[PDB]
């Protein structure tokens, strides 16, 4: 037995890795064909810890 | 769970006779024998010996479905010859051949020293 899981009220529970786009990251994206905006530069700012 | 009894493979049931002889309607002087609780162990062997008989015009056997141990043996013989007799004779022919094979093995085994 390798562990890496919990025992919660008897049953063996696994915490499944959750994907996400990284924070504090600058990314430029071309806007849609009808859009009044041509391109956008987005940043998802948050406090790391 | 829906599986049959292993022994049914060889043990005759209620009113199950080893042989059921029926005449073949389709051809003259022809018969169909249903051998209950049997397989190719006996079927192929009887058919082969029936084929040796000159008076046998037709001999074949089939195992209609593998779930059930039984076979139909069809025998058509020359006029003035009971297929029953062809099978009666073809049987003796197997026993006599085997009786010889027993004695000639026992002879060769007694000859061995290891």
């Amino acid at each position: 037995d390798m562990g890496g899981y919990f025992i919660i009220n008897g049953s063996e529970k696994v915490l499944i890795a959750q994907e996400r786009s990284a924070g504090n990251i600058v990314q430029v994206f071309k806007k849609a064909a009808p859009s009044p905006i041509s391109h956008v530069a987005e940043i998802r700012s948050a406090l790391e810890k | 769970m829906n599986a049959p009894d292993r022994f049914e493979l060889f043990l005759l049931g209620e009113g199950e006779s080893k042989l059921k002889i029926d005449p073949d309607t389709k051809a003259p002087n022809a018969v169909v024998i249903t051998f209950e609780k049997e397989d190719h162990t006996l079927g192929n062997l009887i058919r082969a010996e029936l084929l040796n008989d000159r008076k046998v015009l037709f001999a074949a056997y089939k195992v209609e479905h593998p779930f059930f141990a039984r076979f139909k043996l069809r025998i058509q013989t020359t006029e003035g010859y009971d297929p029953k007799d062809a099978l009666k004779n073809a049987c003796n022919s197997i026993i006599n051949k085997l009786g010889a094979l027993k004695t000639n093995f026992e002879t060769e085994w007694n000859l061995q020293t290891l």
């Binding site: - | 769970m1 829906n2 397989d39 190719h40 162990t41 192929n44 593998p66």
Partner: protein, 147 residues
């Protein structure tokens, strides 16, 4: 199932004497259809068998590792060194008659796994039974003797 997405249920069970045999006395534990190979393109399934045969003959744990310099022609030379048609095939004799099979069958071991779905666990039948309270229609599931 084998380890190549080649699953399947049983069709029938045959005993040793009904089963085809190598002159060597070896009878198969499994009979899989040739048809399930070209469409699928499970070449690694065949290679597993050839290697697994070699391994059992010579007492080795056959390396079936991915990116190696192991060849089908290399393993074939080894299987011939043991005394079997290099490509796996063996002349077999039909169980019912003893008469040789005109075709030579690709025999040998393959590692097969038993899968967690038994027929006696699935099989279901109902002719009247439990009904839901609101809808008054049959209940759901084998467990609940549902419709």
């Amino acid at each position: 199932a084998s380890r190549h997405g080649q699953k399947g249920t049983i069709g029938i069970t045959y005993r040793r004497e009904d089963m085809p045999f190598t002159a060597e006395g070896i009878v198969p534990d499994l009979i899989i259809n040739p048809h399930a190979i070209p469409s699928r393109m499970t070449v690694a399934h065949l290679i597993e068998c050839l290697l697994s045969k070699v391994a059992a003959l010579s007492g080795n744990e056959g390396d079936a590792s991915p990116f190696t310099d192991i060849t089908v022609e290399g393993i074939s030379k080894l299987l011939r060194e043991h005394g079997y048609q290099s490509r796996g095939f063996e002349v077999m004799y039909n169980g019912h008659t003893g008469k040789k099979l005109m075709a030579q069958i690709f025999f040998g071991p393959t590692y097969y796994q038993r899968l967690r779905h038994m027929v006696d666990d699935k099989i279901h039948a109902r002719a009247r039974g439990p009904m839901q309270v609101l809808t008054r229609q049959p209940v759901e599931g084998r467990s609940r003797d549902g419709g």
